[PDB]
Design a binder for this molecule. Structure first.
Ligand code: GTP
Ligand code: ACP
Ligand code: GDP
Ligand code: KB4
Ligand code: CA
Ligand code: CA
Ligand code: CA
Ligand code: CL
Ligand code: MG
Ligand code: MG
Lengths: 56, 437, 350, 428
């Protein structure tokens, strides 16, 4: 059971204890604003289909 | 020194934010007006606590904090509350109408109208920073805002600040205190959309916290105040290394190299001991051995699951109070012989230990008793996939009938995002199963 | 009114337990996927243990111990016994055994102790098995080493007990099956009625490929073995009769000659895996019924063959045992408005 | 998500709508002048949901009173709380609607609808954040049924992103003004299934049976029926009006209660059942509240919950009692009767609690069920409709106002479709 990289200071201590070693597209501003606009389009479509039906 | 910006989204994020900043102030001896007597470098500095607080000429210590809610009630309580002086009005951002428990309404509809303002108020704090490490993001899985806006915010923070680290504090949905019936839908949608934008995420099951409060604090019907003060203790343990002199988990990148070797499997289990009622007249104080041993009881975990039927990829112990390396090594050595602690063939079977000698600080008139030593264990175990299995099942039951889907499609979302989000989760359950069996 | 669900329709034992539970009028049965159960009588494969104990206002019990397959699958049982300090490699009640894969593996270490039993001139015959569905017993193992470098799964190569105890009249073989119930408190309850599954064909030392006088499975004795039901019905000797035989024929009792060794192996096996499977501080509770299968050799030494995690009972005993599972495993947790079992407990000071 | 705009239409709409404003004004400490003489602060924390603040720190209902005849509305002015209401919010024609849906929807009602929409607009513009609308009406007359559904249609056109909520009183041969009620109701339900987010089905059949069988009243009046209505309306609006751990709005109610947009017809329940005046003095225990509120006999919609399955449930406990006893009992009902709650909506029962009890009771439970058993209400009215429609009986009253048989056949069809959909999810 080996105790290693023991660092001490006024506030406390830290260390690692080892027993066994190993048994061995984040999309653009553009692509986002298209997803948000495509959704708003479907929302404006669905609202137009309601106001068309109500106009009937 | 490198600054960390905290972001509190929705009711869960905001109330837990209050709980943490209250505690941080008590720990660093910052008063409600924002004055820190102990701080003798007036008008600035690069101390360890400046990671979380900036300073003004008048010697005022101000959180590197953004609160965001799509509805004003909860942030209005911060604005008029005990810590009103502490915060810059521009850090407290509210809309007029909330996301009505609907991921799609928080993300697409009401999201879009406020995202650019939020990112502007986030950019104002990033500009008061000599070397931004990145972000701590507090939210519910369950809320429309917590789920839906958080995932939009995270996508953009990746774009505007690509080099910076992003940690999550995430409240996983529990029926006993949940408000909505569609929380499984919100949970999966936001996990899917957020997964590649998050380096490390600490999930807290309201179920685990509720039962710790019932069982160990003798509280019949735990409130959010009860749950939140307990959660804030555990968050304080996890963040203490960013705010205090030490050599373990010193910057946000270290959380990832120490706890997350596989980037997708980035959900470390928090275990915390001891939790002791303040109204308990006689309490015989618990040893280094007893509290390290308590880190291997499921009843002390932030998520109820069984680490015995999984494998470990990393395990940190963060001690607060009268602890010294010898007691930890004796404790650890006893515990190997008694308990099933199997690591993956390709990791060292080891612990990383951090001791801060200041015992835990409890809020005056809180439910938690002073203790001379506490520990928070952060283990990345495959057993946590139990939480994903439960949640995915609930999701499959509802989605099989398309129950409530129309509320999401009505906000401009395609039925297809549901099955995509659920495929990612099927893939995630499989990654965990490969690593751990 | 306690609630239960049934997710293993083919379970002889739990079919009968669901029946006895209904017949009390204090247990109703829910639909398979109704999550609001007190009791799960669960499937055999991929039982979703991770969904147990997260239903507020319901104490939940399941009839399986998560991790108990370590004891109940051939290859893992051998790894458990060889790697657990509390049952050393020296362990005197398990036949020398090696795990062998079709082309980790022990094959190199298998030949070192095997090729000392060429030099030794010791009756060096083995058996190989999976986890009569493809069993082989060869002297040298030109066949065995090759036989299943051929078929699907991993296999165990296990010492063959050349010199077994001989029931007379018959000059024949048997295995003993004991039923053990582990309750939620990890009480270990041996059922007082065991059974000797018997061969009906005299045991033959020279012709091994004749899998009839060597293999004692209830299935095999109906198909291949023609003297089925000759001495006892049907290749099933019970404990009164076997005790009587041991008294008449060898002057001992079942208790002294055999059962002390069975009680020792059962409590030794289950106390080993207790820290891995116990549900003491868990959010759901487990019980499980195991079938332990023993061989007695001719010096009256008991050997463990395998543990069965999903065992069937013998026809006459169903009534009694199943009532006992209810009294001890179910009614202990969910109470209503001469014990059948022997409790295995020992606290020797040293 | 603050302001609700309330509308009451026709005789029943206004008699029930008035008793609502009486009961709710007493609970929030408001007197018939608008002056607050209360004592708690939970009363005024969300007063703005139902009330506008006027000159003198006075409270005026955000309420619009609509009728095609002056009768009932002159009876509201005359009534106890008549003076509370903004006088400009009284909109009335003079002709009446003669229990005729067609007159309400197409002839007499069209003449008056634009006036109503002007007063709706004056209240909506003044709103910091409009949640939407609640309407009180019968489905069996002409004004509340036919004009009320015409309003709902116009209001959706002009406010399509706001919630529409109705308290819709269903007709019954046991309490029956005219033979044509099944006609008026079936035409109205068609409108309701298209153009509302959530509808409280208040069944005059149920209100009669509770008055006769349970409350032991031999000759039940509209007053006895309207006592049960005013108690339920208080009940189901608690979490909109009072601060608790659940601060609900009409949208969150809709999202959580309605899994399929057409299945938004709620079966409300109340415990304990009181006949006005004589109120017994034995406070009810939480176990008792829980058993009664879920009992068929306590349902305001004449359906058997055991002939269907609960898609979703909302339950309001009012008074000072153990939070823990409430969670225990609520979990006992579900775990003890789990067959009657769809397995494919996990955790489908939600419970709120409020310290302020209604006038005259120490403790009360209000039940809101989206049960598939509500089909029984709709099948009842379909059978009554077909009995007449097979002989085109009484149709001349409608063709005389420009309507075609076609429109009746379309409405019969939508309602029978609605019944098939309830049936669909009862056998999942
Ligand atoms: N631990 C904890 N959970 C909370 C708290 N507030 C809400 N939750 C949980 O969060 C979920 C509901 O999400 P909220 O955060 O209230 O929702 P929101 O993000 O404000 O979103 P909307 O109101 O839907 O726009 C449920 O599972 C609640 O139990 C809190 O203070 N603490
Ligand atoms: N090492 C050994 N020595 C002698 N006989 C053995 C043996 N191993 C197995 N046998 C014979 O084979 C039978 C058991 O085989 P095995 O242990 O694979 O059972 P099984 O799993 O196929 C059916 P069950 O689950 O009821 O035991 C015994 O009854 C015995 O006759
Ligand atoms: N519960 C209840 N039902 C009513 C009341 N008044 C009328 N009804 C019912 O309402 C229907 C008649 O509608 P009514 O409102 O009088 O017609 P309108 O004035 O044209 O809208 C019938 O089904 C009556 O039984 C009432 O005050 N309470
Ligand atoms: C079935 O799940 C639910 C049922 C009703 C509700 C919810 C969930 N969650 C909400 O926020 C709104 N809601 C409720 N809304 C209203 Cl106005 N009232 C209630 C009374 C009791 C319970 N719930 C509600
Ligand atoms: Ca300073
Ligand atoms: Ca990234
Ligand atoms: Ca005219
Ligand atoms: Cl960057
Ligand atoms: Mg919210
Ligand atoms: Mg009338």
């Amino acid at each position: 059971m080996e105790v290693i990289e023991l660092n001490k200071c006024t506030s406390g201590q830290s260390f690692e204890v080892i027993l066994k070693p190993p048994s061995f597209r984040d999309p653009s501003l553009e692509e986002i604003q298209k997803k948000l606009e495509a959704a708003e389009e479907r929302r404006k479509y669905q609202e137009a289909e309601l106001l068309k039906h109500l106009a009937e | 020194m490198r600054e960390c910006i905290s972001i509190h989204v929705g009711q869960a994020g905001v109330q837990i934010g209050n709980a943490c900043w209250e505690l941080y102030c008590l720990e660093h001896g910052i008063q409600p007006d924002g004055q820190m007597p102990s701080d003798k470098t007036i008008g600035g500095g690069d101390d360890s606590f400046n990671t979380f607080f900036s300073e003004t000429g008048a010697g005022k210590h101000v959180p590197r904090a953004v609160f965001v809610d799509l509805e004003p009630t909860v942030i209005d309580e911060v604005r008029t509350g005990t810590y009103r002086q502490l915060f810059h009005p521009e850090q407290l951002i509210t809309g007029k109408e909330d996301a009505a428990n609907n991921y799609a309404r928080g993300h697409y509809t009401i999201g879009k109208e406020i995202i650019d303002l939020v990112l502007d108020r986030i950019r104002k704090l990033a500009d008061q920073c000599t070397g931004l490490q990145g972000f701590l993001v507090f939210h519910s899985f369950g809320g429309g805002t917590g789920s839906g806006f958080t995932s939009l915010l995270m996508e953009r923070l990746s774009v505007d600040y690509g080099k910076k680290s992003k940690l999550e504090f995430s409240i996983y949905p529990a029926p006993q205190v949940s408000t909505a019936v569609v929380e499984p839908y919100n949970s999966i949608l936001t996990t899917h959309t957020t997964l590649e934008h998050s380096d490390c995420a600490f999930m807290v099951d309201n179920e685990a916290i509720y039962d710790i409060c019932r069982r160990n604090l003798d509280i019949e019907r735990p409130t959010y105040t009860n749950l939140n003060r307990l959660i804030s203790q555990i968050v304080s343990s996890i963040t203490a290394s960013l705010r205090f002199d030490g050599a373990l988990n010193v910057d946000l990148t270290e959380f990832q190299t120490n706890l997350v070797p596989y980037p997708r499997i980035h959900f470390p289990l928090a275990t915390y001991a001891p939790v002791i009622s303040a109204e308990k007249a006689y309490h015989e104080q618990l040893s280094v051995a007893e509290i390290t041993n308590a880190c291997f009881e499921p009843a002390n975990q932030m998520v109820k699951c069984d680490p015995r039927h999984g494998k470990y990829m990393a395990c940190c112990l963060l001690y607060r109070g009268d602890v010294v390396p010898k007691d930890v090594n004796a404790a650890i050595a006893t515990i190997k012989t008694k308990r099933s602690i199997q690591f993956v063939d390709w990791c060292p079977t080891g612990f990383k230990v951090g001791i801060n000698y200041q015992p835990p600080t409890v809020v005056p008139g809180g439910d938690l008793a002073k203790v001379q030593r506490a520990v928070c264990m952060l283990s990345n175990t495959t057993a946590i996939a139990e939480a994903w299995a439960r949640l995915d099942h609930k999701f499959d039951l509802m989605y099989a009938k398309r129950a409530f889907v129309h509320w999401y499609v009505g906000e401009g979302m395609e039925e297809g995002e549901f099955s995509e989000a659920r495929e990612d989760m099927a893939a995630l359950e499989k990654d965990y199963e490969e690593v751990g069996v | 009114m306690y609630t239960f669900v049934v997710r293993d329709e083919n379970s002889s034992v739990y079919a009968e337990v669901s029946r006895l539970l209904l017949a009390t009028g204090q247990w109703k049965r829910l639909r398979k996927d109704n999550p609001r159960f007190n009791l799960m009588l669960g499937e055999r494969n991929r039982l979703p243990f991770g969904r147990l104990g997260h239903e507020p206002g319901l104490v939940q019990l399941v009839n399986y111990y998560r991790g108990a397959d370590k004891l109940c699958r051939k290859a893992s049982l051998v790894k458990l016994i060889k790697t657990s300090p509390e049952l050393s490699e020296s362990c005197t009640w398990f036949p020398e055994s090696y795990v062998i894969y079709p082309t980790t593996d022990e094959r190199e270490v298998f030949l070192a102790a095997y090729n000392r039993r060429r030099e030794g001139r010791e009756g060096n015959v083995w058996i190989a098995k999976s986890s009569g569905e493809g069993i082989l017993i060869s002297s040298e193992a030109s066949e065995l080493l090759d036989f299943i470098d051929e078929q699907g799964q991993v296999h165990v190569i296990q010492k063959y007990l050349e010199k077994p105890l001989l029931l007379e009249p018959g000059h024949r073989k048997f295995d003993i099956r004991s039923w053990v119930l582990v309750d939620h408190l990890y009480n270990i309850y041996l059922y007082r009625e065991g059974v000797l599954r018997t061969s009906s064909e005299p045991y033959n030392s020279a012709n091994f490929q004749d899998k009839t006088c060597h293999l004692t499975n209830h299935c095999i004795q109906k198909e291949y073995s023609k003297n089925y039901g000759r001495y006892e019905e049907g290749n099933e000797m019970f404990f009164e009769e076997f005790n009587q035989y041991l008294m008449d024929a060898l002057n001992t009792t079942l208790e002294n000659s055999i059962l002390l060794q069975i009680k020792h192996i059962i409590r030794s096996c289950l106390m080993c895996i207790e820290p891995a499977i116990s549900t003491k501080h868990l959010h759901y509770q487990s019980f499980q019924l195991f079938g332990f299968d023993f061989m007695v050799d001719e010096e009256l030494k008991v050997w463990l063959i395998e543990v069965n995690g999903a065992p069937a009972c013998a026809q006459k005993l169903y009534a009694e045992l199943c009532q006992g599972i209810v009294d001890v495993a179910i009614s202990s947790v969910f109470p209503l408005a001469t014990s059948i079992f022997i409790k295995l407990h020992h606290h020797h000071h040293h | 998500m603050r302001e609700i705009v309330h509308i009451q239409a026709g005789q029943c709409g206004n008699q029930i709508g008035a008793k609502f404003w009486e009961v709710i004004s007493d609970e929030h400490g408001i007197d018939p002048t608008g002056s607050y003489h209360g004592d708690s602060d939970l009363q005024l924390e969300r007063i703005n949901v139902y009330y506008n603040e006027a000159t003198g720190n006075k409270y005026v209902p955000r309420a619009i009173l609509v009728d095609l005849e002056p009768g009932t509305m002159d009876s509201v002015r005359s009534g106890p709380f008549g003076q509370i209401f903004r006088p400009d919010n009284f909109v009335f024609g003079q002709s009446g609607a003669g229990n005729n849906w067609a007159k309400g929807h197409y002839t007499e009602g069209a003449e008056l609808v634009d006036s109503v929409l002007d007063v709706v607009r004056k209240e909506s513009e003044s709103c910091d954040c409009l949640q939407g609308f609640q309407l009180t009406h019968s489905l069996g007359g002409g004004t509340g049924s036919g004009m009320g559904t015409l309003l709902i249609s116009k209001i959706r056109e002009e406010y399509p992103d706001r919630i529409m909520n109705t308290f819709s009183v269903m007709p019954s041969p046991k309490v029956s003004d005219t033979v044509v009620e099944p006609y008026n109701a079936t035409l109205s339900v068609h409108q309701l299934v298209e153009n509302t987010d959530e509808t409280y089905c208040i069944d005059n059949e149920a209100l009669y049976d509770i008055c006769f069988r349970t409350l032991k009243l031999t000759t039940p009046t509209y007053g006895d029926l309207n006592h049960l209505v005013s108690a339920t309306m208080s009940g189901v609006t608690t979490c909109l009006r009072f601060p608790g751990q659940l601060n609900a709005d009409l949208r969150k109610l809709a999202v959580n209660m309605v899994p399929f947009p057409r299945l938004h017809f709620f079966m409300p329940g109340f415990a304990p059942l009181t006949s006005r005046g004589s109120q017994q003095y034995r406070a009810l225990t939480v176990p008792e509240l829980t058993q009664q509120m879920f009992d068929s006999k306590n349902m305001m919609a004449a359906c058997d919950p055991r002939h269907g399955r609960y898609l979703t449930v909302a339950a309001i406990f009012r008074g000072r009692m153990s939070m823990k006893e409430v969670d225990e009992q609520m979990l006992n009902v579900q775990n003890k009767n789990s067959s009657y709650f769809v397995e494919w909506i996990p955790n489908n029962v939600k419970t709120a609690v409020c310290d302020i009890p209604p006038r005259g009771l120490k403790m009360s439970a209000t039940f809101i069920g989206n049960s598939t058993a509500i089909q029984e209400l709709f099948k009842r009215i379909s059978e009554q409709f077909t009995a007449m429609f097979r002989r085109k009986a009484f149709l001349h009253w409608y063709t005389g106002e420009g309507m075609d048989e076609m429109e009746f056949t379309e409405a019969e069809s939508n309602m029978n479709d609605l019944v098939s959909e309830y049936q669909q999810y009862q056998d999942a």
